[PDB]
Amino acid sequence: IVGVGTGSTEGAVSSSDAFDLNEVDSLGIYVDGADEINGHMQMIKGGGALTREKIIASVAEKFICIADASKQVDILGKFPLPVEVIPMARSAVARQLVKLGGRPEYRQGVVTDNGNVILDVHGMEILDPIAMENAINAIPGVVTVGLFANRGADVALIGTPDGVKTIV
Amino acid sequence: TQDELKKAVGWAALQYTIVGVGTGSTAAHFIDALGTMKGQIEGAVSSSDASTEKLKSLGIHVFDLNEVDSLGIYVDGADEINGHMQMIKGGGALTREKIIASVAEKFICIADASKQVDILGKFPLPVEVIPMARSAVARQLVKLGGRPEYRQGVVTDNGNVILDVHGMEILDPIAMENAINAIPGVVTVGLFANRGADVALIGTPDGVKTIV
Ligand SMILES: O=P(O)(O)OC[C@H]1O[C@@H](O)[C@@H](O)[C@@H]1O
Ligand SMILES: O=P(O)(O)OC[C@H]1O[C@@H](O)[C@@H](O)[C@@H]1O
């Protein structure tokens, strides 16, 4: 049973409509892309979804990130960080995200599969992704934050002009 | 009676605009009290549809939280409150209550004396979970030392399920709140520990005790 991602990049557990997870108690691997991945293997995900991906990744023993070279960064944050939020909490969460140093932007006209909204947070230079993940997860009204930092990639396969580079 | 202790604290909270209003049997008494102020307040922000309906019945205007960018006070009950003013809530609207409490400057906990505990955890801790994550989150709550029990036949206002976690002696509520909030699939945990109560009004046979 393999954990399978979403996006352009026995059976399986799948992260998008494009086994149900409750039917398994473990997954060997989860293979998925990312919007950004840093030198510490920490990622921003959710540009496309977010909650399903992070839950499946939490069950997999090994996260195998697959991406073209453009996704590699030194400091996470140029790509806006997605935060899924309970609708009634949108302005409250936005205020706290400003306090943490970001500029939250409501993703207009989009709802998640859970009926929530997304705030994409611009302008952060996320120097300590675990601390930032923890700070955003502390905010009442946050469902999921697209920082995969406490649980990042275990292996990354990067598509370069020269071939596939494997970073463990 | 226990209900008269609840009534004492609900009314004592009037001592403390747009008012943040909680939910449950103790909060219900505070709403009665607030009704006596129908012509004096601007209105309220409510943590549940039941509270909204009661407020409206007493002529109090109910604003959505998104209509304010700040709240002076939030008055609500709790299932447990410890000596550090940290609470377990959610036995009954957990997500809405925690979001409103995050906006309010002053959280006033109203409770009868039975809610005071030295160590949180005898009352099972509610955890609201995305349905597809139920089993995964339960495995992690076991690893953290709890016994998660699916609250059968209940769904939250957000369409999620609740795991009530039994058997924890929560010696460090902030650490535990942070550990549960870290779990993918957790929406909200009913530990109010990073943001606890600022004032507690405890109803006792000797009168209402105020703890700040
Ligand atoms: O590989 P792509 O098309 O760049 O898509 C990446 C996106 O698909 C998912 O993995 C997401 O988390 C993410 O945002
Ligand atoms: O005052 P009561 O009736 O004990 O009700 C307490 C409950 O109502 C709400 O505050 C909840 O968070 C909580 O579980």
Q: Does residue B130 share a domain with residue B67? A: no
- Location of structure tokens 């999620």: B160
Tell me the C-alpha distance between B210 and B43, whole Å.
25
Q: Does residue B158 share a domain with residue B66? A: no
Q: Does residue B63 share a domain with residue B44? A: yes
**Whether B130 and A57 lie within 8 Å, measured CB to CB:** no
Angle at B139 between CA B134 and CA B145, to 5 degrees: 125
> What tokens does B206 get?
């000797």
Tell me the C-alpha distance between B84 and B201, whole Å.
14
- Residue to mutate among B157, B158, B174, with most A CBs inside 10 A, is B158
Tell me the C-alpha distance between B79 and B180, whole Å.
18
Tell me the C-alpha distance between B137 and B128, whole Å.
10
What number of CA atoms fall less than 13 Å from residue B176's CA on the CB side? 27
The secondary element (H helix, E strand) that includes residue B45 is strand B43-46
Q: Report chain B's terminal Cα–Cα distance, integer Å.
A: 25
> What tokens does B175 get?
């650490």
Closest C-alpha to B98, from B125, B124, B117, B61: B125
Strands B207-211 and B186-189: unpaired
Tell me the C-alpha distance between A22 and A43, whole Å.
25
Q: Does residue B177 share a domain with residue B206? A: no
For residue B34, the distance in angstroms to the closest alpha carbon of chain A comes to 24
Does residue A7 have its Cβ closer than 6 Å to ligand 1?
A: yes
Contacting residues for B90 by C-beta, under 8 A, at least 6 apart? B79, B97, B125, B126, B128, B162, B188, B190
3 state DSSP class of B134: helix
> By what technique were these coordinates determined?
X-ray
- Residue to mutate among A26, A143, A144, A150, with most B CBs inside 10 A, is A143
Does A102 carry a binding-site annotation?
A: no
Does residue A70 have its Cβ closer than 6 Å to ligand 1?
A: no
Q: Does residue B24 share a domain with residue B36? A: yes
Q: Does residue B164 share a domain with residue B86? A: no
- Give residues preceding each break in chain B, C–N over 2.5 A: 16, 92
The secondary element (H helix, E strand) that includes residue B178 is helix B173-181
> What tokens does B94 get?
């957990």
Q: Does residue B165 share a domain with residue B110? A: no
**Whether A86 and B187 lie within 8 Å, measured CB to CB:** yes
Q: Does residue A137 share a domain with residue A104? A: yes
Q: Does residue A83 share a domain with residue A29? A: no
Tell me the C-alpha distance between A7 and B167, whole Å.
42
Tell me the C-alpha distance between A81 and A69, whole Å.
19
CATH number at residue A117: 3.30.70.260
Query: Into how many domains does chain A fold?
Result: 2
CATH number at residue B31: 3.40.50.1360
- In this structure, is the dihedral angle defined by the CA atoms of residues A150, A136, B162 and A3, taken in order, positive or negative? negative
Instruction: List the single residue in A with minimal CA-CA distance to B184.
Output: A55
For residue A47, report the distance from its CA to the centre of ligand 1, in Å.
6
Query: How many angstroms is the resolution?
Result: 1.2
How many Cβ atoms from other residues are within 10 Å of residue A11's Cβ? Answer: 10
Contacting residues for A5 by C-beta, under 8 A, at least 6 apart? A15, A30, A31, A32, A33, A53, A66
Strands B43-46 and B18-21: parallel
- Location of structure tokens 């409510």: B46
DSSP conformation letters of A72-100: B-SSBTSSPEEEEE-GGGHHHHHHHHHHT
Closest C-alpha to B193, from B78, B105, B85: B85
DSSP conformation letters of B58-119: TT--EE-GGG-S-EEEEEE--SEE-TTS-EE-----HHHHHHHHHHEEEEEEEEEGGGB-SS
- Location of structure tokens 């399986």: A12
3 state DSSP class of B31: helix
The length of chain A is: 168
Residue at B190: amino acid letter? G
What Cα–Cα distance (Å) separates residue A13 from each residue in A33, A148, B181?
15, 19, 24
Nearest to B102 among A52, A57, A140 (CB): A140
3 state DSSP class of B186: strand
Tell me the C-alpha distance between A138 and A153, whole Å.
23
Kindly list the strands in the beta sheet with A147-148, ordered across the sheet, starting from the edge strand earlier in the chain.
A36-37, A43-44, A147-148
Tell me the C-alpha distance between B105 and B189, whole Å.
20
Q: Does residue B73 share a domain with residue B174? A: no
Residues of A in contact with B95 (CB under 8 A): 86, 140-141
Kindly state the DSSP code that residue A123 receives in the 8-state scheme. S
Q: Does residue A60 share a domain with residue A24? A: yes
Cβ pair B80, B171 in contact under 8 A? no
What Cα–Cα distance (Å) separates residue A144 from each residue in A63, B8, B86, B199?
18, 40, 24, 31
> What are the beta bridge partners of residue B211?
B200
Q: Which domain holds residue B131?
A: 119-190
Cα B56 from chain centre: 21
Q: Does residue A67 share a domain with residue A8? A: yes
Cβ pair A51, A83 in contact under 8 A? no
* Ligand lying nearest the CA atom of residue A147: 1
Does A165 carry a binding-site annotation?
A: no
3 state DSSP class of B147: strand
**Whether B130 and A92 lie within 8 Å, measured CB to CB:** no
What Cα–Cα distance (Å) separates residue B178 from each residue in A40, A71, A95, B189?
22, 30, 20, 9
Helix pair angle (A129-137, B173-181), 10° resolution: 100
Cβ pair B35, B68 in contact under 8 A? no
> What tokens does B84 get?
């550090």
Residue A120 dihedral angles phi and psi, to the nearest 5°: -95, 125
Atom 1 in ligand 2: which residue has the minimum CA distance? B26
